[PDB]
Amino acid sequence: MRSLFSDHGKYVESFRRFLNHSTEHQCMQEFMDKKLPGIIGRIGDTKSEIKILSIGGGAGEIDLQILSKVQAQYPGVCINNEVVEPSAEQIAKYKELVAKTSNLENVKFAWHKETSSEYQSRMLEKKELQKWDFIHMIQMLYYVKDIPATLKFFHSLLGTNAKMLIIVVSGSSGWDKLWKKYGSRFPQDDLCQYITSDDLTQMLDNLGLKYECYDLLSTMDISDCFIDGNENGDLLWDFLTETCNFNATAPPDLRAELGKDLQEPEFSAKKEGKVLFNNTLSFIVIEA
Ligand SMILES: Nc1c2c(nc3ccccc13)CCCC2
């Protein structure tokens, strides 16, 4: 069993199938529309330049949406948005998106090709420490080695009335169950790392930071995962298991318990003849 994250090709295909059969993206859309406003309501107060640091170039369309809400609250104010992404493929895509978008004259972009870690290391070399008004980490901690250290660092980069926003899958979610129980039995990679909003609050508690957590429901239609032979079904399987060609490369003893175990409540809910996997999300905001 080889980690799915080691086959850039498969991954994407799957990831893509994941978005196509989930309310993930719309879920964040709702957060940004009905909650974000009041959250970032004062990060611009008294500043003639609003700085926004985004760690991860995977949700370009979401980043842009954040800008939309920040511009609305602070008309005229120029915005400096830096992006810290390791994947050239991503940055590349991001950029394309920028060029095709309007109402971004009062925004300055700057992409840095590296990891949160590398970025962080560098900064320390600099003598001066630079602050920020808004930091955010959408679905990417999974790929961070030192969470506690990472959290504390960027918190210190927050300026006055600044805020840091983090998104991960919720403790009360299918993923949680899927990992607490089966994890050990899946390919242990050094790149990925199973983490839930739960692991998060404990770390933040022990760190002593003041945060606020919000959960919203999101689903993943895994119906094609019971139709033996279905191509689509196969990809999805690859995703949950974060493994390559899961079926044809895993112990049926296991693939047997899952097939059963997934169609159960604590993992999924049965709807319009559909089997919906609990993809609930958590949004954490941290004060400076
Ligand atoms: N829903 C997601 C999960 C992971 N990464 C993701 C990356 C961005 C979009 C959603 C994601 C890793 C493990 C589990 C779930």
Residue 176, ligand 1, Cβ within 6 A? no
Bridge partners of residue 158, in order along the sequence: 132
> At a CB cut-off of 8 Å and minimum separation 6, what does 257 contact?
none
Q: How far is the CA of 240 from the centre of ligand 1 (A)?
A: 10
- The H or E element that residue 35 is part of is none
Both tokens of 182, joined, read 């089966």
Both tokens of 54, joined, read 């985004």
Angle at 65 between CA 60 and CA 66, to 5 degrees: 100
Q: How many other C-beta atoms are found inside a 10 Å radius of the C-beta of residue 8? A: 11
**Determination technique used:** X-ray
**Is 90 a known ligand-binding residue?**
yes
Residue 179 dihedral angles phi and psi, to the nearest 5°: -90, -40
Task: State how far the alpha carbon of 43 is from the alpha carbons of 70, 99, 275, in Å.
Answer: 9, 27, 42
CA dihedral 63, 66, 68, 73 (to 10 degrees): -150
Tell how strand 281-287 and strand 211-216 pair up: antiparallel
CA distance 34 to 56: 23
Spatial contact of 4 and 244, defined as CB atoms under 8 Å apart: yes
CA dihedral 257, 259, 265, 269 (to 10 degrees): 170
- Tell me if residue 64 falls in helix, strand or coil: helix
Residue 143, ligand 1, Cβ within 6 A? no
Compute and round to an integer the Cα radius of gyration of the chain: 20
> Does the CA dihedral 224-184-188-190 come out positive or negative?
positive
Q: How far is the CA of 280 from the centre of ligand 1 (A)?
A: 12
Give the chain's length: 288
Q: Which amino acid is at 25?
A: H
- The H or E element that residue 55 is part of is strand 50-55
Which phi-psi region, left, alpha or beta, contains residue 242 (left: φ > 0; alpha: ψ -120 to 50)? left
> What residue owns the CA closest to ligand 1's atom 15?
169
> Does the CA dihedral 118-124-126-129 come out positive or negative?
positive
Alpha helices in the chain (DSSP H): 8-20, 24-34, 36-39, 60-73, 88-99, 116-125, 147-156, 174-182, 197-207, 231-240, 246-249, 252-262
Domains of the chain: 1-288 (3.40.50.150)
Spatial contact of 204 and 154, defined as CB atoms under 8 Å apart: no
Q: Which residue has the tokens 């089966």?
A: 182
Exposure letters 119-151 (e unless 16+ CB within 10 A, then b):
bbeeeeeeeeeeebbbbbbbbbbebbeebeebb
Residue 193, ligand 1, Cβ within 6 A? no
Q: How far is the CA of 113 from the centre of ligand 1 (A)?
A: 21
CA distance 107 to 79: 5
To one decimal, the resolution in angstroms is 3.1
